[PDB]
């Protein structure tokens, strides 16, 4: 996993996300959908949004952003002891939503990009490295659960 030092950097960084969860959540989805349009086909409630302007204006899309970052924040706060919180999530994503593990890689990249754009001077190589390692741990644990459930991880 990560050292206590690395977890400290991930939590301080997350401190910046918590100051505007809706703003960061909205940007992560606009990057994700514009960057990897196939991901949009998994959200039956958003498929009709075709332009960047329509996405930016969607309060429903902003609410989804809040849901995702709220859940992820709760997990990162566990510093690796997140067996309990990941289980339900792998379960719904694999079996109900049908999200390939690769889309979790796309959304992680989107998170890194938003942090770079919104906090360019404050999100340095140390904080970025730690944030990448935490998201990698998170994805690897989900992937492990997908395999347990009989899906490709
Ligand atoms: C950091 C990664 C993510 C987190 C923490 C996360 C979390 C959430 C949670 C908390 C919900 C609501 C409860 C549930 O249904 O399980 C949810 C709903 C959903 N998630 Fe994710 N998710 C992640 C990534 C993704 C990705 C990459 C996709 C699609 C490309 C996806 C698609 C969905 C869909 C289709 C739903 C239902 C939306 C609506 O309610 O119809 N998720 N996710
Ligand atoms: C999942 N959003």
CATH number assigned to the domain comprising residue 85: 1.10.490.10
- Tell me, using a 6 A CB cutoff, whether residue 72 lines ligand 1: yes
What method was applied to determine this entry? X-ray
Classify 44 as helix, strand or coil.
coil
Q: Which residues have a Cβ under 8 Å from the Cβ of 30 and sit 6 or more positions away?
A: 52, 55, 56
Q: Which residues have a Cβ under 8 Å from the Cβ of 130 and sit 6 or more positions away?
A: 2, 6, 7, 9, 10, 13
Q: Could you tell me the resolution of this structure in angstroms? A: 1.8
Number of domains in the chain: 1
Classify 79 as helix, strand or coil.
coil
What range does the domain containing 59 cover? Answer: 1-153
Contact 21, 66 (CB under 8 A): yes
CA nearest ligand 2 atom 1, residue: 68
Token pair for 99: 């999200």
- Using the mean position of ligand 1's atoms as its centre, give its distance from the Cα of residue 92 in Å: 8
**Angstrom distance (rounded) from CA 78 to CA 91:** 19
Sole residue written with tokens 């719904």:
92
- Using the mean position of ligand 2's atoms as its centre, give its distance from the Cα of residue 96 in Å: 12
**Angstrom distance (rounded) from CA 130 to CA 77:** 14
**Angstrom distance (rounded) from CA 102 to CA 110:** 13
Token pair for 39: 């991901």
Which ligand sits closest to the CA of 96? 1
- Using the mean position of ligand 1's atoms as its centre, give its distance from the Cα of residue 68 in Å: 7
Terminal CA-CA length for the chain: 19
Query: Which whole-number Å values give the CA distances from 121 to 13, 125, 131, in the listed order?
Result: 12, 10, 16
Nearest to 140 by CA among 91, 105, 94, 98: 105
DSSP code of residue 80: T
């Amino acid at each position: 996993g990560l050292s206590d030092g690395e977890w400290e950097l991930v939590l301080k960084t997350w401190g910046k996300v918590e100051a505007d969860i809706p703003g960061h959540g909205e940007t992560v989805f606009v990057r994700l959908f514009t960057g990897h349009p196939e991901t949009l086909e998994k959200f039956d409630k958003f498929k009709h949004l075709k332009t960047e302007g329509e996405m930016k204006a969607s309060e429903d899309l902003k609410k989804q952003g809040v849901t995702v970052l709220t859940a992820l924040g709760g997990i990162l706060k566990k510093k690796g002891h997140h067996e309990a919180e990941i289980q339900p999530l792998a379960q719904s994503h694999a079996t109900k939503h049908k999200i390939p593990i690769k889309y979790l890689e796309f959304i992680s990249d989107a998170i890194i990009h938003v942090l770079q754009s919104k906090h360019p001077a404050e999100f340095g190589a140390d904080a970025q490295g730690a944030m990448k390692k935490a998201l990698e741990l998170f994805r690897n644990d989900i992937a492990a659960k997908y395999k347990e459930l009989g899906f490709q991880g």
